[PDB]
Amino acid sequence: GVEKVPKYDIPTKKVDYVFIELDKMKPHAQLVQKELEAFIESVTGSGIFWKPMLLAKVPGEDMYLIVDGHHRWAGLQKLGAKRAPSVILDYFSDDVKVYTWYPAFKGDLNEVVERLKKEGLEVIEDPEAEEKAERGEIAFALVGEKSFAIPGGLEEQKKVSKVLDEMSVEGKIELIYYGLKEDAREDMAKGEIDYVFIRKAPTKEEVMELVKRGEVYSPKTTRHVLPFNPDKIDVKLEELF
Ligand SMILES: Nc1ncnc2c1ncn2[C@@H]1O[C@H](COP(=O)(O)O)[C@@H](O)[C@H]1O
Ligand SMILES: [Mg+2]
């Protein structure tokens, strides 16, 4: 997939799954095309669905927030499947923590910036872009050798994400999402990526608030972390219809 594997593997737990209908699931985020395609090819090719979705009950509604699993959800619906193996979490428990994923690329800075500016974004050279972005003052900081501020909020975050999605589909960049910006910096020094986009993470209150209004975030906005990762499950794709 598009995400960088964590440098430390947290403990696994054999939590088991329950089938939940895909049309009872509510997205809070947009999709990355390469992440969707990779899941569809993996599950159809292998015949096995091995990672349960993470869900939480939406307050006041007979629906579940997709905590983690937007591409599995979209991909399965696209394939015509009806349900997915799921884990129902207590969203406001202190055992659900939320951070973010940082978009990153190996590719030409100048072509990326040009495409961002063509979409109407401002990309302003700014040595304090990173800390502005961590404070939530700008949409993203574009940081590597150079440092740029991208002003705005959610709409600009969507615009940025869309440019990267398109450039990724066109083969002009390799698009990778990092859980930790320090991992991105380490890979920069190895030459494995050139630039990373820094953003402040949402809070759990903001996520549910946003979903209750029927809105979505830009892709990979939340990185939810539990005290464990569920163990691999062994569900046939045919069992999801
Ligand atoms: N055959 C498969 N069954 C279940 N999950 C998969 C499969 N192949 C890839 N994935 C995962 O599907 C997820 C795609 O993104 P998302 O569903 O949005 O979390 C990633 O966590 C991948 O690790
Ligand atoms: Mg995921």
The domain that holds 103 is classified in CATH as 3.30.1760.10
Instruction: Give me ligand 1 centre to Cα 70, in Å.
Output: 9
Q: Kindly report each contact of residues 204-211 with a partner whose C-beta sits within 8 Å and lies 24 or more positions away, as own/partner.
A: 204/91, 204/92, 204/96, 204/98, 207/28, 207/65, 207/98, 208/58, 208/59, 208/65, 208/91, 210/28, 211/26, 211/28, 211/58, 211/65
In this structure, which residue's CA is closest to atom 23 in ligand 1?
A: 1
Residue 44 and residue 108 in one domain: no
Instruction: Give me ligand 1 centre to Cα 178, in Å.
Output: 16
Query: Rounded to 10 degrees, what is the CA torsion of 152, 70, 211, 103?
Result: -20
Closest CA to 240 of 26, 39, 3, 34: 39
**Using a 6 Å cutoff on CB, does residue 71 contact ligand 1?**
yes
> How far is the C-alpha of 39 from the C-alpha of 25, rounded, in Å?
18
Residue 151 and residue 68 in one domain: no
Residue 22 and residue 121 in one domain: no
**Using a 6 Å cutoff on CB, does residue 158 contact ligand 1?**
no
Q: Which ligand is the nearest neighbour of the Cα of 1?
A: 1
Instruction: Report helix angle 109-118 to 154-169, nearest 10.
Output: 130
Number of Cβ within 10 Å of residue 106's Cβ equals 15
Structure tokens at 191: 């030459």
* Structural domain total, the chain: 2
Closest CA to 121 of 109, 133, 102, 139: 139
**Using a 6 Å cutoff on CB, does residue 223 contact ligand 1?**
no
Number of Cβ within 10 Å of residue 16's Cβ equals 11
Residue 160 and residue 178 in one domain: yes
**Using a 6 Å cutoff on CB, does residue 68 contact ligand 1?**
yes
Residue 165 and residue 127 in one domain: yes
Residues in the chain: 241
Instruction: Give me ligand 1 centre to Cα 125, in Å.
Output: 36
Solved how? X-ray
Residue 211 and residue 234 in one domain: no
Show the DSSP H helices in the chain as ranges: 33-46, 70-79, 109-118, 129-134, 154-169, 181-189, 204-212
**Using a 6 Å cutoff on CB, does residue 43 contact ligand 1?**
yes
What does the longest C-alpha to C-alpha distance in the chain come to?
53
Closest CA to 50 of 237, 232, 239: 232
Domain enclosing residue 173, as ranges = 96-225
Residue 106 and residue 50 in one domain: no
Residue 8 and residue 85 in one domain: yes
Contacts of 102 (CB under 8 A, 6+ apart): 177, 178, 179, 181, 184, 196, 197, 198, 199
Residue 76 and residue 124 in one domain: no
Residue 91 and residue 158 in one domain: no
**Using a 6 Å cutoff on CB, does residue 28 contact ligand 1?**
no
Residue 240 and residue 207 in one domain: no
Contacts of 225 (CB under 8 A, 6+ apart): 10, 96, 97, 98, 99
Ligand 1 atom closest to the Cα of residue 46 is 1
> How far is the C-alpha of 161 from the C-alpha of 103, rounded, in Å?
8
15 phi/psi in degrees, rounded to 5: -80, -10
